[PDB]
Symmetry: D2
Subunit: 392 residues, 4 copies
């Protein structure tokens, strides 16, 4: 298959740029030039690139340096036609953030973290970014008595409310996406799942400007069903962005190519995002890959893995489409009553009193008879896998 700008595949500069220095070893690859990343990505079919402030401008660069870098990067986007759909800020690498950015126990660190983000918001707006992703990687703790969670949530909220105020006042029109993660690098991270991130956002001052950026591996690190979690995020209308990658259950964050981890879940996910209501996708934003080319690879391996992500997504889409289009699947869906869940439980205008008066809903209901009918779910599931396998 072939990727189009209409596919909206984006990559973080820190992905193909990952030098492969893990917690147990040194880097196996040399640094990638931002400008080269831009030309290579354009070439493999991506429509946009994302970056952390510190991925593009080395922490501590003077404005002369800083300015120079931005200018060149800007030219590259220009020549290639790539856009910057999202930007983020690094609030986890520097030792100052060892206890967090926004929720560090140290007050001075909190002030500093806000400033770092405001600045990145400025660059984002200049480059045309529409979404600010916030990954609070260091917000959390290793020991329960070290962090007052309530105070931490107040401080997270305080910081976010200021960011929305500024964006709205400067007219940047940004949307903010909170990225949930259960652990790593902190023992436990605040807002561990898509669920906790959504509940939190609901308490902000201008909640309509806030949503989440869920990551495949993050939810899988707690053994949760990523597809079901996205379905919930979509129900709430809080899916502002998405990070796609692969993981093999609860272990360190692997960041494999999308679909190289839980393949069956990767398939139900593409199905959910693409076979939305009335043909059209259920999701319209970037399909962003936040993965890492394995430590054992060289730059050849790097570009290969970049293309594998696109490839995986397009192969899955194709099968998800074929799945839904199959009259036998259509028949199995009917037998399993999947669409019957869309019919309200209650009749039009029916309330508690009418329901209480309906003898068929209780007094005269044959639970035993209904309890014996099968749902035909294994059969429908088998049909889906055969489509995935290209056997149908």
């Amino acid at each position: 298959v072939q990727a189009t700008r209409e596919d909206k595949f984006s990559f973080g500069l820190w992905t193909v740029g990952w030098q492969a220095r893990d917690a147990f070893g040194d880097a196996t690859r040399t640094a990638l030039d931002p400008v080269e990343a831009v030309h290579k990505l354009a070439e493999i079919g991506a429509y946009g690139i994302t970056f952390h402030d510190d991925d593009l401008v080395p922490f501590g660069s003077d404005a002369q340096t800083r300015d120079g870098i931005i200018a060149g990067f800007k030219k590259a986007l220009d020549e290639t036609g790539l856009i910057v759909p999202m930007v983020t800020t690094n609030l986890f690498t520097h030792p100052v953030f060892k206890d967090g950015g926004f929720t560090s126990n140290d007050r001075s660190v909190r002030r500093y973290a806000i400033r770092k983000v405001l600045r990145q918001m400025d660059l984002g707006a200049e480059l045309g970014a529409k979404t600010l992703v916030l990954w609070g990687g260091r917000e959390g703790a290793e020991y329960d008595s070290a962090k007052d969670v309530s105070a931490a949530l107040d401080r997270y909220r305080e910081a976010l409310n200021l960011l929305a105020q500024y964006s709205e006042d400067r007219g940047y029109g940004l949307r903010f996406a909170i990225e949930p993660k259960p652990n790593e690098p902190r023992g436990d991270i605040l807002l561990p799942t898509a669920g906790h991130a959504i509940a939190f956002v609901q308490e902000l001052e201008r909640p309509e400007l806030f949503g989440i950026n869920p990551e495949t591996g993050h939810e899988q690190m707690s053994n949760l069903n990523f597809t079901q979690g996205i379905a919930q995020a979509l129900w709430h209308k809080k899916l502002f962005h998405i990070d796609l990658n692969g993981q093999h259950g609860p272990k360190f964050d692997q960041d494999l190519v999308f679909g190289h981890g839980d393949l069956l879940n990767a398939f139900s996910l593409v199905d959910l995002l693409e076979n939305g209501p009335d043909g059209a996708p259920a999701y319209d934003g970037p399909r962003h890959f936040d993965y890492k080319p394995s430590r054992t690879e060289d730059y050849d391996g790097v570009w290969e893995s970049a293309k594998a992500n696109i490839r995986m997504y397009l192969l899955l889409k194709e099968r998800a489409k074929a799945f839904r289009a199959d009259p036998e699947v259509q028949e199995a869906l009917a037998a399993s009553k999947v669409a019957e869940l869309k019919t309200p439980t209650l009749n039009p205008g029916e309330g508690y009193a009418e329901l209480l008066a309906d003898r068929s809903a209780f007094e005269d209901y044959d639970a035993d008879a209904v309890g014996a009918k099968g749902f035909g779910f294994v059969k429908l599931n088998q049909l889906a896998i055969e489509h995935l396998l290209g056997a149908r």
Copy 2:
């Protein structure tokens, strides 16, 4: 230490009454009589008892029978001075509920599920219960194509809105507590974590009436920090009830005595609930034990395990109090800056314009120097554990 009615320990009829019939073996204990249970629980110090409809009145009892049982039950309550703080409905045992109660693909089961709950609401109202716990144990799926998550959430919401309507029209004054669980019996259950449940509740018609009933073991089945999730629930003011028990990480639901699984987290949990805001508890509801006496035990074991739950709580409470009262702990808390998180990041009347004008929050900030100072968190953790072990 001895239990008082003020401690508010409650137990489900189904905990001490569990016959220990598991997924791989027959029951090892005979049935426990409800009046007996009330009398034994009163004796060990419980202040209240809870039950699913079907735990008290056998599924399908005729009115005469049903009526007879309730009368006997109320008399035992009367005599012992035990109350019924919460009631729930069994929407998971009977085969009709194999694909869910409120979210079954089958429209007729959904209708029947609502009628079964209304009926239990009337009984709870009659007994003076204040909370209706809803555990959607069969809501979810084994296969992703079998359940439309979006339609399921619509139907779950449709049903809850009706229950609140009825409660409010009738003047019952009930509060509704949704109980999250990631899995078991279904592959994946809808609303898997405390977070997912809180986010959901914020979308109902009368949200002020809805909260959650998180269970220690359910959060631990996903390897999440239970204390930290309770802290967030308290921040949202949605902790309506709590189910206490023990678990050893992600595996089937063990339902051990509280404190017999993750002891360190059991300790931080009691500290959070009891060493509240003033000096006063941060949570005022029932301390409910939803556990199961191990299958290897007889009725002497059952009564021993019931008392063990109260004993673990009182012993942890005592050490949590001692921890907070220690001057060396006060000192370690001061060195770790725990309390500094409670001070707003911004000075009163400061906005983004004033922050941007503060050179010290960024332009002249010495991040390297701040990043070199230690938080002393290990030492604080070490004092906590020494209090737990009675080593101080």
Copy 3:
């Protein structure tokens, strides 16, 4: 494709016969007659059937009743041509086994467990079974101080030595396969992984008569790589039997159809078993499905799920074959140096003296240059998945 007797697909009577009573609810299906199960399995292409003593003959049947069941059973086998490749004993259902069979703390239970097994060996030997599977589902503990592991391993060994003795004396020619499981129904089960079982087997009086019966979901319950553990079992030559099914990581035992859990691991498992050394399979015993038709299904869903197991194995086999016959895959294998691992590290006749003498192995080794070459692993993994997807 269609299954042939040469495929050696077998099913436990307890799989298609599971009535679906789980830990939270009643059975949803009526009991399956063993004769009927023989006929239906024959019909879908199974070559054999297996059973626990108690699956065929109800616990406590008098000798006339037991004899009658066995006779009708044998007749069905005869008429269909199905064989009984393995038999097993239920040492987990009856309350007497609540603390285990061979390792119960109670001496009398240990004596009775051995007698129950001996009696099953007789029946197995008479039906022609070649393997006795031993699943100690109840050997273990919920609490560390309740069980002396060392004493427990001594007792385990004590029982197994007797069984080997009896079999050898009677000329039964049975092979014994211990089945590891990490937990469920005990909090922790003895011999938790394929590794622990293999190490234990090695300490018996006649180790050559003992191997393991590893199950897909059981290793996945600990989030281990099943194919990789199977590879090691094959290296030790201890894979006497195999239980195939599906699971989604660490949670209760799901027993899904084979391939419906971790699809990618199912794929690599079929590759390992069939594309063995010298053209031929690496394993020649039964391909046994120890799964359960989901609780949502009726008897139609039961047979559909039995057939899904076979279809899943055959589709994966087909794709594994095509994978290996692809010149591009071969080229990738060569580039990744997979086969170079099969060449001894030392030259023929080289010892440490000569290795110490080779400056090319150290003194003149350019670690830095080798360290920069990519292995091309991602590209290889991508072709593997494109074969599975039927995209190649």
Copy 4:
């Protein structure tokens, strides 16, 4: 309490020397001088220190420098009285080992790896070390088709056979301890659990020279019961060394202070090692702490955390002894029939013939009456915990 040299507390140079560069951020601490390390550890009570070649002598140090470093190191040991009980080799950091050391697909890497170990064996022998720990951190894969496990086991064996040969011929008298780990840094590591490592060792040429070095955190990363695995290791007589630390279930390797993860399991572990048969410890090797001072800490937090490891072990020891000495515990052990498991199942001289003749073990056995009696395990567990809380 206070540590004595008889407690045999040892620490790796890399533990207190960890600079805190994690997968997501820079080092927060400066480098620790080895001589200083020797001095600091002697002061807190350690009886020994251990290290990887590369911890002591910088990778790529000329002969002169290396020699220089060693001589200073020997002086510090001299001056302080600390010994080097164990030494290990770094086969995971340098880029050349990205695919492993001993089982790298690349043959030239395997040869280099052996050379690097021989050299450390010499230094080890010279410093008086008794054990060579082998941690194959890079032995494994991210993708199943990239590693022939069988070939890798052959190459692993091939390398160990040679090391044994060398050590025996040089008269070093070393014992070899293989350290299992399930994952991190490789997606899946070979010899993932204590079980797998023991099974492997049994296949070597001089098995009496090999054992294992299990780490608390490693077994817990797979959610296995550490104490139970150590109990099996002792049964096999393969506990050559042990790494103590803390972990919070399946997630990245946390390396917390011993007893800061699963407290209940740390208690049962100390009980097992110390309350050995004949009053005496069941294990007499070094109690080695392979942990990491949290990244939020400075050098003071570093020495605080080192002392915390010793304090935890000694406080647990103290409670394990009090527990065993309690008459009420003694009464609970008897009711639980813990010791009845040590009495053989068969009477002296009984074999299957006599067991078959015993009607009381089967024909006249009342399984129902035995099945109704409880084991009193909950009460026994509750007493263990009250001893741990210092409540008794």
